[PDB]
Every structure is written in structure tokens, then in C-alpha cells.
Amino acid sequence: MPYFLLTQAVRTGNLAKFNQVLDQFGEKFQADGTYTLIIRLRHNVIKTGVRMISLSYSRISLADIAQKLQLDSPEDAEFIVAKAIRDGVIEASINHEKGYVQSKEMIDIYSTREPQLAFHQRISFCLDIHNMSVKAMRFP
Amino acid sequence: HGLKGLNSKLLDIRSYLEKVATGKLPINHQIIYQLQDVFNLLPDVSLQEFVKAFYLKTNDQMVVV
Amino acid sequence: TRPANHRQLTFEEIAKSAKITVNEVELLVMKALSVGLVKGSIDEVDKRVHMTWVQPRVLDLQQIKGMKDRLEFWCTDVKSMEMLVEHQAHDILT
Amino acid sequence: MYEQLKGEWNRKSPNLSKCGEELGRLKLVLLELNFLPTTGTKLTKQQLILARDILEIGAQWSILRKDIPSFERYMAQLKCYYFDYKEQLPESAYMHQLLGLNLLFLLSQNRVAEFHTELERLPAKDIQTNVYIKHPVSLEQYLMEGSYNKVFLAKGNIPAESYTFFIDILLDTIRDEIAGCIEKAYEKILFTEATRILFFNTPKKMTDYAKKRGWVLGPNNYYSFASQQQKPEDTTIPSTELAKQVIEYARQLEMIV
Numbered sequence: 001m002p003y004f005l006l007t008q009a010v011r012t013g014n015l016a017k018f019n020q021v022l023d024q025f026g027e028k029f030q031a032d033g034t035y036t037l038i039i040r041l042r043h044n045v046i047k048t049g050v051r052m053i054s055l056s057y058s059r060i061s062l063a064d065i066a067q068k069l070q071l072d073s074p075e076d077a078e079f080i081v082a083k084a085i086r087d088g089v090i091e092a093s094i095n096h097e098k099g100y101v102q103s104k105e106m107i108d109i110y111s112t113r114e115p116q117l118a119f120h121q122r123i124s125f126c127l128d129i130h131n132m133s134v135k136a137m138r139f140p
Numbered sequence: 141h142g143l144k145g146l147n148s149k150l151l152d153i154r155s156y157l158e159k160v161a162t163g164k165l166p167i168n169h170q171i172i173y174q175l176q177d178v179f180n181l182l183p184d185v186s187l188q189e190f191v192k193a194f195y196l197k198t199n200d201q202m203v204v205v
Numbered sequence: 206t207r208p209a210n211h212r213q214l215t216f217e218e219i220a221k222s223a224k225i226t227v228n229e230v231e232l233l234v235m236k237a238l239s240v241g242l243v244k245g246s247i248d249e250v251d252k253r254v255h256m257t258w259v260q261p262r263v264l265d266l267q268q269i270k271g272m273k274d275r276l277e278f279w280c281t282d283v284k285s286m287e288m289l290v291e292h293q294a295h296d297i298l299t
Numbered sequence: 300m301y302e303q304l305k306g307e308w309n310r311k312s313p314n315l316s317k318c319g320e321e322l323g324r325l326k327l328v329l330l331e332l333n334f335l336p337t338t339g340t341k342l343t344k345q346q347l348i349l350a351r352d353i354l355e356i357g358a359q360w361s362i363l364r365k366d367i368p369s370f371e372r373y374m375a376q377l378k379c380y381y382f383d384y385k386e387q388l389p390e391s392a393y394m395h396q397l398l399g400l401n402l403l404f405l406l407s408q409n410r411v412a413e414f415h416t417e418l419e420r421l422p423a424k425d426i427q428t429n430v431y432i433k434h435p436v437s438l439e440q441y442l443m444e445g446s447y448n449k450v451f452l453a454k455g456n457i458p459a460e461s462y463t464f465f466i467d468i469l470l471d472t473i474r475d476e477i478a479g480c481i482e483k484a485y486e487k488i489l490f491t492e493a494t495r496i497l498f499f500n501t502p503k504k505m506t507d508y509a510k511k512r513g514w515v516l517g518p519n520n521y522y523s524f525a526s527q528q529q530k531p532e533d534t535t536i537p538s539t540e541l542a543k544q545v546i547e548y549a550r551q552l553e554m555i556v
Binding site for chain 4: 076113123
């Protein structure tokens, strides 16, 4: 009941409920030893939507993300987007010439260059299963 | 040892044009470099389409893994 | 002059060095393909002329000197990277 | 012996010789016996009462003179005295602002991972009371989301001592980071954008970032060049090491029987 209703308030843009259920269920947070969420998850209260928008949209104007994050200011919304790309939350870029915030490029060389860098571990893990099988085989 | 002959034929063609660029023996104008003039144009390594040879490398890898 | 380093020659270099007009560089290279001293191809949206060349002739001792340096780079690439393969796969060689 | 507990503390300390007397006071206390076991014995805790107090006023005189390796030196030994295993040790009334000096210093030099793991030893003083500690953790919360300006509008409110020798460094390491964002491909603006983004309708700060940074004022137009690299690629570079990996595949198939 605390944690399911916690992420209930996180997904919506409501902070008054977020502060209410902190006050309601803080003593349960005392038993779990997790006081520190209130100081470090209020960061992601504003950063969850900008992760959600930049995954949905592809080439957005900063004048429209202000009302969509209900921040009512385009001038600091540059800085929230600047902090998220600084933290590597979204890989996107900003056009600071006429107000464009565009996302990344298309699906990349993922079909060509990547998959052997997953395949090397799976060779090495499965033959070690074959090695650990054969070495521990014959006790009689 | 297939590649140990690749430098062995290379060290022989190394020694020949050292002693004819030096200029000891007369330059065979007919075949000794005119056939090499044909040779020295075709190690084509043009990248950005031959880079896309390597999902077939992933394909040859995929059956192994 | 450029030995297949970037042999995709642009049209203005031919039109200047042959001092021919721009519209006649295509009829000039189709003649050289018709004779058979070159086996390239022609792009026209970029107007760059791709080159594959099989006609040999004399090469005037100074170009052996540059051919030596390219053969010496060719030497240490073959030699050292064979020592990499042999030292790596020594125990399954026999 | 028992050297000037409030000698030149209250009015002024322009001293350099009492700094040597404090230097000798360090040679007195830390050569008495030790402070390592600390089993019981309030009588041998009595010099531990004074050893805290002389390092508190040593940390007071350190920030009075702005010595950076010394200030972490006195504070670590003070934190080692709150690392006492048998802490009877009545509450010195300077502790909360002393840790607030440490909380603000370690915030300023970009020890942000060390910042939050420092906050574990504070049970409930962050919420109930203690504006000496509540102010830098409200400051770090302002650095969290997007709120640069609430930091600089709470600049004119320190309930503690002046804190100026830390917050001059703390804001300078903010200004160059936003300068580090604007020294990217963001090409040209005017002084009024340096007034809005950076701050400060004209002081000599526009001279400060003309000489430190670039930002030459042209025909009422600044200039910042492109910091974007060329990205040299071949993407057949791993041809050696991929040829290495397949060798130990068959080497681990054969040869180990």
C-alpha cells in the first residue's frame, strides 16, 4: 500500500499528494530504513515527464514543453532539459537557434556492429558450462 | 605458413627493386614491372559499403554462438 | 598521379588540366573507355568520375622509390601481424 | 599548558604568533598521551574536551584565513572526535555550524557522491531543527531539479556566519559549468543573454569572461566557435582483436581435454 500508491503519485504530476503520503506513510518508511527518498526522488518528480515526453516526441519545441510539463516558463525549461542531457537521462540534443529540441537519430548500426559484443559472452559462458561439466564428471 | 610465404614472396620482390632502383642490372622494360603496373591498383578497401559486409560476419557468427 | 587512394576524380580537375570545357568531359571519357585504356564509370548527379584502370606503361625510376616505401609499409604489416597470430595460436599449431 | 581558550577569539585575531602558539598547542595535546583507546575515565576525557575545543577554534581561525588543505585537516580530526567509540562527550554548542562548514565545503568541491553518504550519520536533525545543516541540504535540493535562480536568490540569506569563502567557490564552480554548456556549439548571442543566463548587468564580469573565456564583442554580437570534433572512424578497427577472439574459441575447444 505505501509503495504502489507512491508510484501512483509519481506518474501523475501531483506533488501535494506526494507530500501528503510522505506524511501519511513516513513511519512505515522509518521501519524500512528509507528516509532518503524525499530528498532525492523530488528530482525525478520533474524528470519523469521529460523522460516521457522525449521518448514520445521526436522534434519538439521548447515553447510547448513548458505547458506540457505545466512549468509555465520556457526560459528555465531549457535548463531542466539541459540537466537531463547532462545526466544522460535522454540522449537527445537541442537546437538553440529557434527553439527546437529534437530527439536522436533512427535505429543505428545495431543490426550490424553490436551483436557480436553480446555474442562473445554467450560463447564464453556456455563452453565454461561444458568445461565445468567435463572436469567434475568422473568420481569413480 | 600460407602467410609465411606471403612475406617470403614479398621479401623477394623487396630485394629486386632495391637492386634495380639502385640500378645495377638493366631494367626489363617489357614485363618485369609492366605486369606489376597492372598489379598495383587492385587492393580496393573502400570502406562505407564494405563496412556493411560485417553483418554477414554477424550472420556467420550467429550460427556458431 | 593519385594511385587509387581516392581515385573518384571530380570533373573540374579534368576540365582544368585538359583545359576542355565542362560539357565535353563526358564525351572525352567515353572515348577513352571506347578505346580501352581505362575501365571506369561515370556518375552525373555528382559529376564525379570513378576509376578502375588496367593499362600499363613505363614508370621512370623515381616512381620505383615511392613504390619501395609502399612496399616497406606492406612489409611490416604482413610481418608483425603474422607474429601476432603465431604467438597467439602457438599451442594448437604443432 | 591550558593556553588561551578564549585568548583572541571574541574581538579579533590578526595573530601570526598565536598561530604558532596554537601550533605549539597542537604539540602539547597530541603529545600528552594519545586519544586512541578511550575506554572510560572522564578525567582523561577532560583533555578530550579541550582537544575538541582547540580544533574548533583552529577551524575557526582556518576559515578566518582561508587555508584549503588545513580546513579539511582540522575538520577530519574534529570528525574523528565525533568518531569516538565511547562518546560520553557533552554537546559542544559549535557542532552544527562546524558540520555545516564541512557540508558546504564538500558540496563546493564537487564531492556530490561524498555529499549524500555524509548525510547518513544525521538521524533527524535535518527535518526538526538545525538551520545550519538545513540550509545546505535545501541548497542541494535547489541544485537537483532545475532551479538555479532560487540558489542565487537565497544568496542574501545565511542564518549562520558569513559562509562567503565557500559560496564564492560554490557559485564559481556553477558559473563555469553553465559556461561549459555555452562554450559548446551555441554560436552567438549578445551581452543581454550573458545578462540573463550568466548574470549581472555590467560589472567587469564581462571583462572576466572576455579574458578567461573567449566571447569577443563584435558589432554588438558575441562569438563562440564550434567545439565539435571531426570523429575519425574506420569501423574495421577491431579486425585484429576479432581475429584474436576466434582463436581462443578453437583454443578452448581443442587443446584442453
